């Protein structure tokens, strides 16, 4: 769960 890893990547 993040939160600090936003977007599709």
């Amino acid at each position: 769960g993040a939160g600090n890893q936003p977007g599709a990547n």
Partner: antibody, heavy 119, light 114 residues
Framework: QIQLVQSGPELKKPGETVKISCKAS????????MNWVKQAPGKGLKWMGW????????TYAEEFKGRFAFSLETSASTAYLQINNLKNEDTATYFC????????????WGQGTTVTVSS | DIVMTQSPSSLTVTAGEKVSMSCKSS????????????LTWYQQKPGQPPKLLIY???TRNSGLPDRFTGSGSGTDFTLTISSVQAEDLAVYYC?????????FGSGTKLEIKR
């Protein structure tokens, strides 16, 4: 009871430096990054960048590289925006916004800080 | 960068009618990995900060009144208000949340005919 409280309005002269705080409460601070959004008067929203609350590493949009700096104070659960060398185009309301747990949206928003640049 | 285009720019309705507004994106915001569209809808009333309405292009935020419906996929997206009330006066923004930079649209302003 999740709340983002930003610092009060600031009046600066052209060329100076301003620092806006955004204190977070009600959640685990280092699990959600912090976005900064600019709103000039009568205009729309522009995303400026974000800061990762766990690593400290900021990422800025291209218009906001060089004069803008994101900062953290994890002990106080606070995010900081610093604007150096103020111009009249910096007169705006600046919002801090928390990245959601989905990683797809901005969940909670601060009330905004109005920065006025005038002599 | 990804450009988010919003249409109409402004529209005026009487209370109780249905409205739809469009958000189109320069790149696709669908990822098959989670089978989700990374587009967000925010609402901004006069004087207030933007309030989150819909994330993942269809999911309502908790506590949202059921007149607000998000729709669409890929590059074409729609926000619908079933029966507008006088409190729904606002500017509605969409945001690319697929890739950096996470850009906003120019917004759709909702005004009321009385």
């Amino acid at each position: 009871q999740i709340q983002l409280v930003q610092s009060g309005p600031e009046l600066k002269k052209p060329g100076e430096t301003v620092k806006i705080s955004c204190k977070a409460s009600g959640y685990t601070f280092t699990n959600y990054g912090m976005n900064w959004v600019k709103q000039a008067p009568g205009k729309g929203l522009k995303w400026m960048g974000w800061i990762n609350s766990n690593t400290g590493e900021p990422t800025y949009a291209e218009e906001f590289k060089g004069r803008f700096a994101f900062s953290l104070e994890t002990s106080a659960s606070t995010a900081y925006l610093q604007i150096n060398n103020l111009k009249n185009e910096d007169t705006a309301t600046y919002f801090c916004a928390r990245w959601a747990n989905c990683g797809c949206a901005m969940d909670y928003w601060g009330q905004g800080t109005t920065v006025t640049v005038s002599s | 960068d990804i450009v988010m285009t919003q249409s109409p720019s402004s529209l005026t309705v009487t209370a109780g009618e249905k409205v739809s507004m469009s958000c189109k994106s320069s790149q696709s915001l669908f990822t098959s990995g989670k089978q989700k569209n990374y587009l967000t809808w925010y609402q901004q009333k006069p004087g207030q900060p933007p309030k989150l309405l819909i994330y993942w292009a269809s999911t309502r935020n908790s506590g949202l009144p059921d007149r607000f419906t998000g729709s669409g996929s890929g590059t074409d997206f729609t926000l619908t208000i079933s029966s507008v009330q006088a409190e729904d006066l606002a500017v509605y923004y969409c945001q690319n949340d697929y890739s950096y930079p996470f850009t906003f649209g120019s917004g759709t302003k909702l005004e009321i005919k009385r």
